């Protein structure tokens, strides 16, 4: 099928709420080894976000039930299901990260700052999703990797992008969240979110709906954290 047919299949799967198929179609488009358009980038991001979000929500449900429940066989089954879904989610994240390192980040030119920040934010996001379910010695690495991606995406977006750009704002939001939840460092989380929010407010006249949606998310997080 032609590339346009694959994009149409991704949109079809999104209409049918079959996000596995949407992610697979966008993965084929990525594997064509050509740079992705704005809409194609957004389709890939949304598809894999929904795919991994189903698994994250299932994992949270079962992990909560696991701690909420003297029966050893019941607990054994609950843990088996918990790590079955753990492995499913980790496989989704590994797929996304290998797509990012082999095709998307690689094909970015030295000056494709916007899409490079996009893909590095995706890298930080999926390493953070790995860190959410990682325990013990294996956690420290994935955490590190996420911090390595976000921070890089930070330095680029702070230097080459407007403060009210939705990609810079979204990266700031997810970076703040990574500092709050994964690092238990609320000081830098609040400082990051507040600096991004204030820098976007200071240039609000140069806008738009996605930008202000992300800004409202930033303020909601800041209100939750204080």
């Amino acid at each position: 099928v032609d590339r346009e047919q694959l994009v149409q299949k991704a949109r079809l799967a999104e209409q049918a709420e079959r996000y596995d198929d949407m992610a697979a179609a966008m993965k084929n488009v990525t594997e064509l080894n050509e740079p992705l358009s704005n809409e194609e980038r957004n389709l890939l991001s949304v598809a894999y976000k929904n795919v991994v979000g189903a698994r994250r929500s299932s994992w949270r449900v079962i992990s909560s039930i696991e701690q909420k429940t003297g029966n050893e066989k019941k607990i054994e089954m609950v843990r088996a299901y918990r790590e079955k879904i753990e492995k499913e989610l980790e496989a989704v994240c590994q797929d996304v990260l290998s797509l990012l390192d082999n095709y998307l980040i690689k094909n970015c030119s030295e000056t494709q700052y916007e899409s490079k920040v996009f893909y590095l934010k995706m890298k930080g996001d999926y390493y953070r999703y790995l860190a959410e379910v990682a325990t013990g010695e294996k956690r420290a690495t994935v955490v590190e990797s996420s911090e390595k991606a976000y921070s890089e995406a930070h330095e680029i977006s702070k230097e080459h992008m407007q403060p009210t750009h939705p990609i810079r704002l979204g990266l700031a939001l997810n970076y703040s969240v990574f500092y709050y939840e994964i690092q238990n460092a609320p000081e830098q989380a609040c400082h990051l979110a507040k600096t991004a929010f204030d820098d976007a407010i200071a240039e609000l006249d140069t806008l738009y709906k996605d930008s202000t949606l992300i800004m409202q998310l930033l303020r909601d997080n800041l209100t939750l954290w204080t």
């Binding site: 996001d125 979204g170 939001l173 939840e181 949606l213 992300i214 998310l217 909601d220 997080n221 939750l224």
Partner: peptide, 6 residues
Amino acid sequence: RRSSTS
């Protein structure tokens, strides 16, 4: 509740 991401 969990913090918001986008």
